[PDB]
Design a protein around this ligand. Sequence first.
Ligand SMILES: [Mg+2]
Ligand SMILES: [Mg+2]
Ligand SMILES: [Mg+2]
Ligand SMILES: [Mg+2]
Ligand SMILES: [Mg+2]
Ligand SMILES: [Mg+2]
Ligand SMILES: [Mg+2]
Ligand SMILES: [Mg+2]
Ligand SMILES: [Mg+2]
Ligand SMILES: [Mg+2]
Ligand SMILES: [Mg+2]
Ligand SMILES: [Mg+2]
Ligand SMILES: [Mg+2]
Ligand SMILES: [Mg+2]
Ligand SMILES: [Mg+2]
Ligand SMILES: [Mg+2]
Ligand SMILES: [Mg+2]
Ligand SMILES: [Mg+2]
Ligand SMILES: [Mg+2]
Ligand SMILES: [Mg+2]
Ligand SMILES: [Mg+2]
Ligand SMILES: [Mg+2]
Ligand SMILES: [Mg+2]
Ligand SMILES: [Mg+2]
Ligand SMILES: [Mg+2]
Ligand SMILES: [Mg+2]
Ligand SMILES: [Mg+2]
Ligand SMILES: [Mg+2]
Ligand SMILES: [Mg+2]
Ligand SMILES: [Mg+2]
Ligand SMILES: [Mg+2]
Ligand SMILES: [Mg+2]
Ligand SMILES: [Mg+2]
Ligand SMILES: [Mg+2]
Ligand SMILES: [Mg+2]
Ligand SMILES: [Mg+2]
Ligand SMILES: [Mg+2]
Ligand SMILES: [Mg+2]
Ligand SMILES: [Mg+2]
Ligand SMILES: [Mg+2]
Ligand SMILES: [Mg+2]
Ligand SMILES: [Mg+2]
Ligand SMILES: [Mg+2]
Ligand SMILES: [Zn+2]
Lengths: 206, 122, 53, 122, 113
Amino acid sequence: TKGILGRKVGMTQVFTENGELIPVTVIEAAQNVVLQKKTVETDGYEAVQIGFEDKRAKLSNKPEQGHVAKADTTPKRFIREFRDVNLDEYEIGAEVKVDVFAEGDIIDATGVSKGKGFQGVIKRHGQSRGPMAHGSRYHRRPGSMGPVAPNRVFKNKLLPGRMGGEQITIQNLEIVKVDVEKNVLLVKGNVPGAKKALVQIKTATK
Amino acid sequence: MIQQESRMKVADNSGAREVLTIKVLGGSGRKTANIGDVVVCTVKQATPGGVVKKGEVVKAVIVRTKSGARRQDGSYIKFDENACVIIRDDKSPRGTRIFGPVARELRENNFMKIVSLAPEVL
Amino acid sequence: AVPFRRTSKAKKRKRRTHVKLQLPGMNECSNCGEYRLSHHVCPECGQYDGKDV
Amino acid sequence: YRKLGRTSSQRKALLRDLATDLIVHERIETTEARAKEIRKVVEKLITSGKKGDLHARRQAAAFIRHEVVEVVQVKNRPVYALQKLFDDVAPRYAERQGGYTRILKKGPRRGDGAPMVIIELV
Amino acid sequence: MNKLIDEITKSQLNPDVPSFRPGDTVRVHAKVVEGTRERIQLFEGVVIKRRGAGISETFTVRKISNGVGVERTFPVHTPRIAKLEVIRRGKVRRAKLYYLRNLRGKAARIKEI
RNA sequence: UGGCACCUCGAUGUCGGCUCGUCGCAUCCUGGGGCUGUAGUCGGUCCCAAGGGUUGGGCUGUUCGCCCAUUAAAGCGGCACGCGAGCUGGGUUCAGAACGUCGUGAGACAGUUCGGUCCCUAUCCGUCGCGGGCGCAGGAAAUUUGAGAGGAGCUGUCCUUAGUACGAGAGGACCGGGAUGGACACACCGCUGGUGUACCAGUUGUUCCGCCAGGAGCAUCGCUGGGUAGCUAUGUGUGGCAGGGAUAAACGCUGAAAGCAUCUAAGCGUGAAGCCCCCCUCAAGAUGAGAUUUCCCAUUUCUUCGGAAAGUAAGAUCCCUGAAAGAUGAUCAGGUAGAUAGGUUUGGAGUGGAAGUGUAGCGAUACAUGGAGCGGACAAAUACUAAUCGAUCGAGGACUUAACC
Ligand SMILES: [Mg+2]
Ligand SMILES: [Mg+2]
Ligand SMILES: [Mg+2]
Ligand SMILES: [Mg+2]
Ligand SMILES: [Mg+2]
Ligand SMILES: [Mg+2]
Ligand SMILES: [Mg+2]
Ligand SMILES: [Mg+2]
Ligand SMILES: [Mg+2]
Ligand SMILES: [Mg+2]
Ligand SMILES: [Mg+2]
Ligand SMILES: [Mg+2]
Ligand SMILES: [Mg+2]
Ligand SMILES: [Mg+2]
Ligand SMILES: [Mg+2]
Ligand SMILES: [Mg+2]
Ligand SMILES: [Mg+2]
Ligand SMILES: [Mg+2]
Ligand SMILES: [Mg+2]
Ligand SMILES: [Mg+2]
Ligand SMILES: [Mg+2]
Ligand SMILES: [Mg+2]
Ligand SMILES: [Mg+2]
Ligand SMILES: [Mg+2]
Ligand SMILES: [Mg+2]
Ligand SMILES: [Mg+2]
Ligand SMILES: [Mg+2]
Ligand SMILES: [Mg+2]
Ligand SMILES: [Mg+2]
Ligand SMILES: [Mg+2]
Ligand SMILES: [Mg+2]
Ligand SMILES: [Mg+2]
Ligand SMILES: [Mg+2]
Ligand SMILES: [Mg+2]
Ligand SMILES: [Mg+2]
Ligand SMILES: [Mg+2]
Ligand SMILES: [Mg+2]
Ligand SMILES: [Mg+2]
Ligand SMILES: [Mg+2]
Ligand SMILES: [Mg+2]
Ligand SMILES: [Mg+2]
Ligand SMILES: [Mg+2]
Ligand SMILES: [Mg+2]
Ligand SMILES: [Zn+2]
């Protein structure tokens, strides 16, 4: 089990040696370091804490600056944890490189979706419209709220609200090419989030 | 993208001229057939003195479409009309000649006789 | 689409707990000594950023 | 860009008017968004005046309104906004790259509480 | 843009392709793979459109065969095009030639420059 | 289908369809079994099983029913015959008119026929999203455990085992392995397409810029051909993989009561798409308010102690520039310790060969200078313009017991 953090750079395509053409998404994973190690004698569970991007000392405060100084490095912008990983490696303060992966591994991508605002029930939940001719006055409405007997409306009655912006993971997603010098990672397919988002890449659970 | 009520020209030597599609085979809620897909259909127009008569229920294979297919190498093909070839219970045509170009995807579906008879397999 | 019961005084005041208005964001002009809004031209001495406008 | 409560033709006519009064008077008082929009147009126009071609002059004349700035004893013929833009305003900013205008906030209007500013080119 | 994608994909651009623009006649040597055989067939027609930037650029060629018009779209930098060559230099006034989809002979003719 | 006449006549809207579902099991499909008048393939009947699934049309206002073509299957029922302050108004059930029939007549008919007003700004609970307050025995910044809850759960065809087992032939397997789909779900815009009202070009009528040339206004963006960013499906990627624990019907082992027999009584083993896990998401207001790492510290006045106020530390905000976020709050990126937005300079997509001048032609026009000119939202540099100056909030940590102390 491995894992790094990176930013979603863009979206493109490459030609394989076979001849076919595949879409890939580019992820840049520079400057991530191991910060803290969580153990079962001290915390109750085993994990590693990784920080991703250096940021100006103007933007960081004393608590987090002391936390990162404990591992002899500069304050980081993104900090996350990885479980199900082997604690024998990951010396505190050591850096994680994209070469932990290799061409052909199957990974998992985790990120926060693009944000859609207050969206209706047809975009949000994929409902069906009513007729838009033949005298109808019912086009993009939710539906019946339920029967009469309960004197109330049940839960999970799907209604309009804020649409996007949740955590999404999509899995069993192959890797294509690793460039160590440019700290990039070409991985085949889509990942959630807008450009410049944070993407958490780790070995497939299954 | 050909569904029920779609009406396509037939491109072989049998008596038919024009065909309306009844049902797209290959699933329960299936709603679309494309190149290389067998479809049940009826004859809306025939040439006089042909083998296949008007108002007859037959099955046939789609041979070219205005929205064609994409290939693994990233290339596409598109024709100008939707064409059809009436076939038997197995994959052998009921005519003797085939008119116009024919898409390559028929070879991978094991429609070998039609590919043999076609004047061009693009 | 029409009130079933009239609203009591307690419920009315409870609803109006949030119907106040905030306090203006002002400070004192260095040249004036008088009050003015931040990032605005003061109306008294007509200066902004130590220069006359 | 931002729609200013009016359709595309009315919005374009508003922006052509406001960009012309800034050229003629060098200092006008308007609202906040209405000023944050003419900030861009006036500076693109001044850049066109900086080039100083005939192509640039025609391209600017396709936007300036045709109104007299002031009449001079040259025979006493008037001058127009385009002449001032290409002869007076543009040579001022020969050694300046960008940012030919600034906005200074004033305060709300009595009638409708609109936040008024002052935009003036220096 | 996003110059990092350009750096990643710069190594796979095909430098052998000649310069053509929509409106002129080209001949394409495309590698078609049968069940187990490698073969090259020709595709000749007028280029109808050319869109995109970088490694994701494509072009479209139109031909009339046996009375039915065919259009075929390729990536510019694909390795399945053995060779591309230009025969004629048509004269047009567009960038996308979609009006040729409704014209038959003697009206779908392109002049020469 | 009825019987009764208990609530409602100071009003409880009726059939069918649409949108949206949820529940029962007397199970239509898929899963596991017993008997067979079960050779194989296919069946009949019963038992356990509610996890998911359960089609598109022709006729009729129709429910229903018949028919066409599919499908693994085209389940039966409840919810005011679920759902009209969610929609329709074809039927019934208002005033007009006609037919058949009944009546002397005015008229009538669970007979037919053509036409016929469907009102309402959501107070309380309920449901879907988003904030403010206080609490969590000091004040803050991050990273998290997981009680508990929601989602998902479907299935075909082909190849091989194998023309093997079985069968006189005809025909044709169980069990296991692989490949590829239908419907559904999540994400995204590199590809194919859609849109793109401050992008590019052609063109008609008329008015304007004093005239030519070049442009502008109005005519649905006047019309027409393309199209960037953004948003998108019909486009692309991925998912339901492989499993573990205890069981239901059932099958057994050892074994007496009852010298035998017996799956049960004590004791063991197998056994389902189902139960609990695994997988995805929310989650400490979980008042049972949890854990880890780091930062600030023990000030001054009064108090009858309890306690109060009044400047601060770490930190945060007011205010301002904004977008990858957004109804508004909120979230996120920044505030000269500066690339946050606009401009400027280089580019890019897109359109397609600008103006001026010259040449050829009587002229419309064509060619050259020249992949030219323009170029919203896309990219990189650059403090030129605006994020100036200031103000506000924010701790000194109660008691008891237990271990080195
Ligand atoms: Mg519908
Ligand atoms: Mg309407
Ligand atoms: Mg109740
Ligand atoms: Mg207009
Ligand atoms: Mg191009
Ligand atoms: Mg009854
Ligand atoms: Mg009685
Ligand atoms: Mg009543
Ligand atoms: Mg009443
Ligand atoms: Mg049962
Ligand atoms: Mg069964
Ligand atoms: Mg069975
Ligand atoms: Mg069900
Ligand atoms: Mg009909
Ligand atoms: Mg039901
Ligand atoms: Mg009701
Ligand atoms: Mg009902
Ligand atoms: Mg109804
Ligand atoms: Mg109701
Ligand atoms: Mg009616
Ligand atoms: Mg009447
Ligand atoms: Mg009579
Ligand atoms: Mg009428
Ligand atoms: Mg009618
Ligand atoms: Mg009627
Ligand atoms: Mg309403
Ligand atoms: Mg709260
Ligand atoms: Mg739990
Ligand atoms: Mg609870
Ligand atoms: Mg469910
Ligand atoms: Mg796209
Ligand atoms: Mg596009
Ligand atoms: Mg003229
Ligand atoms: Mg006018
Ligand atoms: Mg247009
Ligand atoms: Mg077991
Ligand atoms: Mg199981
Ligand atoms: Mg806590
Ligand atoms: Mg930006
Ligand atoms: Mg801040
Ligand atoms: Mg800038
Ligand atoms: Mg700098
Ligand atoms: Mg260009
Ligand atoms: Zn002042």
